[model samples]
Target: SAVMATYLLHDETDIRKKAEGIALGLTIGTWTDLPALEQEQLRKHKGEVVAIEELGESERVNAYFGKRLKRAIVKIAYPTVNFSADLPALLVTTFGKLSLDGEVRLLDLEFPDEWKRQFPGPRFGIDGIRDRVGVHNRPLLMSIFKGMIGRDLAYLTSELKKQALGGVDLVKDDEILFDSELLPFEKRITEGKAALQEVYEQTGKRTLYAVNLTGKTFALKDKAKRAAELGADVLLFNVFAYGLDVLQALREDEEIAVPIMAHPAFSGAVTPSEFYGVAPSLWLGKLLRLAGADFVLFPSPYGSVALEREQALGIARALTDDQEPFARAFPVPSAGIHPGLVPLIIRDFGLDTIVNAGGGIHGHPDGAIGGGRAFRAAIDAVLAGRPLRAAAAENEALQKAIDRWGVVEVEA
Candidate 1:
């Protein structure tokens, strides 16, 4: 299959005229004033308009601002190439120049399977992550370390133990956390491994530690290899900050046999625009899975980011949808996640999701362990078909959590 690009345009011009303009603007058709022969020649081989329709004189979606709009779906005649190109090249062929065109937004993208095979999806996706955590039939729980940098190994170890005791399935280094003299990369991994192992022995429950593998571009692979060697169970990465290819390379490295968690750091600058940039589905969803992210983290609508719930749901679909039997990536809806939001997370992401939270798990009035217990209590209540309020009354941790954050109803 050839690359398929979808776009939405907000303008008063005729829909077909705009669609042809995009089909041409994206490929060989530049100046309308070009000679007839040149235009015809380009038309024979340039991008073609696969389909176009009138959305109407007014927009039905996101039109509260009161603006008329139209949409278009274009399919280029680009043939499959045995050639290899980085992410930039693939995008260049698709939305490269048209991205700069005014009044246009890339709404969606679809890639061919042959091209996808070159990029292994995930080494450990939904089932693999569940297997690692020894959890089944419910959402996996995850927590992020707060105030990542400038903290000593002692502090990191303390927080790690607390979260583990709270019964989190996995704990991850904060995205902003990086190598520093206070807690060097190797030291953090080693200390974290010990902390998690200790927790495992006592609880008979496993929790994987995902150390954020960050550094210069040239140093990532070697660092990842070293982390794996040092017993780091999972490797966390700012996939957007570095490159999707870097994550792919790490996943393919025979020596780095751990899961990769893709962080949505710096993705906002590339996605949050209606008339510019790529769609959230392409960057946070399909691309991350194709680039080998076993788990992907994104801002949830209930959280501070307040991204559109529909768009967030679409992102989840893109991450878990079938693609060559490659394991489905776990969509971790985070940002402002808390025990109060569990039912909503489950309703939107299903049981395969990772209900990740930072302050939600640490900011509880009781503490990190209490916060974790609160989350689990909420999950238990949901799974048992019991109300959170009812569950909270019996579970002290959950009671404190609901009292602090209040309770809300969410679909089953």
Candidate 2:
């Protein structure tokens, strides 16, 4: 039984008529990126061009027009695709002068269901994460450290210690923000690890703390490796910044192994076009799953991204919804969320999800710890089947959090 390989995409079908005729052959996957070896593989296809290439554009920017200056020149093929393989180069060539969006979706990559394994996919995956967290039936409680760029290490560590006490299953650094004048990454890594380790030790529970690793692609590798050596359980990466292969490389690495949380930074317009381009569920969900992510952050449709709630549900199912044997990825719905959205997130994602509350944790009326408690409390509420509004409405701790730290603002 041969696998089903579909025809070329419309824009592509016009250029490569042969692709339209083939029902099933080898379906070569082309992404915004392909790693070193994969890059070499692409070379063999330049003349023969086995894979169909996609053209990206600016329509997604209509939302961002009033916010920033923007422009784009979309092209992904041959010499252009080859030179643009380098992420920075790709960024410049596609949306270079344009303000990028926050959405993440897969454009085109359809091969036989069999070829899915051609590249070794996520090692630990969703099952692995649940196994690691020791949760067989429920979603995990996760949060981001409040932005404290100029704050002292003591301030940051103290806040972490509190989140652990209050029941934060995972506590991480904000992906976009790097270490600062007062508490930089090196110190944050050293001290943050020590602090969280103490929390785990005292509480007899494990909580992941993902530190941000952003810079040149190679430097990102060093940071991930270093974080692992220092005993980090989670590594937060701005995936678009590094390109897709970066996560694959890390997950495949034998020496340094840890779960990754894929952050959507400059990769929003991945599926900018309505009629074409990759779909969000495909990119942020399936592709990230293929690339190896224990947890992937997708902008919440229920909240800011303005995506339809049904679409958000699809993304959630793409993660928690199981397809056994093949490990699933955890769907983390974030972006413009607060205590108000907690119930929706919990119910929508179900127990297998990972609830990520960033500013909400630090923005609590009582304090950062209070904010964390409010989040956990909301999870507890949802798990117990209590209405989120009812549960969080009267609770002072969560109310304070909801009242204070709000959502992450994306200017669309």
Candidate 2 per-residue lDDT, tens place, 1-412, comes to 1211111232312334333222111123352367778767665434223455544434455444433312221222323333322324433332332223232222333333444454445677777877776766656877777756667999888977887777778887877677567876677778887887798788776766777776777776677777778777777888876777788788778776888888867657564455334566656766677677778888777554556677677666665545523477778887766665666665567667777776666656666667667877777776777765466677777656555644233223
* Candidate 2 ranges with C-alpha deviation above 4 Å: 1-108, 179-186, 201-205, 389-395, 399-412
State each candidate's clash count: 0, 10
Over 148-204, each residue of candidate 1 has an lDDT whose tens digit, in order, gives 677799999999999999988899988888789999999998998898889989987
TM-score, cand. 1: 0.90
RMSD of 2: 9.3
Q: What lDDT score belongs to each candidate, Candidate 1 first? A: 0.80, 0.62
User: How do all models score by TM-score?
Assistant: 0.90, 0.70
Model 2: lowest-lDDT 10 consecutive positions? 1-10
Q: List the residue pairs that clash in candidate 1.
A: none
Candidate closest to the true structure, highest lDDT: 1
Model 2: how far residue 288 lies from native, Å: 1.0
